[PDB]
Amino acid sequence: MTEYKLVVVGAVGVGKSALTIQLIQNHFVDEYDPTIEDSYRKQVVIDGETCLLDILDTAGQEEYSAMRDQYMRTGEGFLCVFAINNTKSFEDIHHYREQIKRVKDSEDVPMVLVGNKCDLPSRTVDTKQAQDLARSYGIPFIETSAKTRQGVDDAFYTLVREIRKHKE
């Protein structure tokens, strides 16, 4: 029974926690402790295929957990999240991608670039910039809003689809 191990990474407060909780619990959490790293499971049907999602919601502690090491190693796909109204978070993406390639020691790691907070009118990272970056990386780019659930199933499911391709 297919389990997908997904790892959500990105600058603090881009909405890694809010996105994961939205997917798992179907509500938007305005305040989720920035430091709390946790894992979540959900059974979902994606393209008629039922699968188990096993999601690590990272909260970039510099505190050594054996679990987190195992997770980066055994994480099958990575959501690289930025906020569309946060330029720094976008600049950081490159760093996250690099890290993941180094951990996995591979140029072909299933990954999705996620522009979160699509609900905001105060956009500072245009879609085309994000699309250009994703294109350079040869990965999907998805716009999400954890607040409105826009593209939330899409982001996670797309990563699963990336993993499915990779495995097959």
């Binding site: 987190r68 090491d69 980066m72 890290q99 180094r102 951990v103």
Partner: peptide
């Protein structure tokens, strides 16, 4: 990566 942290 964590496993040098930053060790040159």
């Amino acid at each position: 990566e964590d496993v040098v942290g930053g060790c040159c």
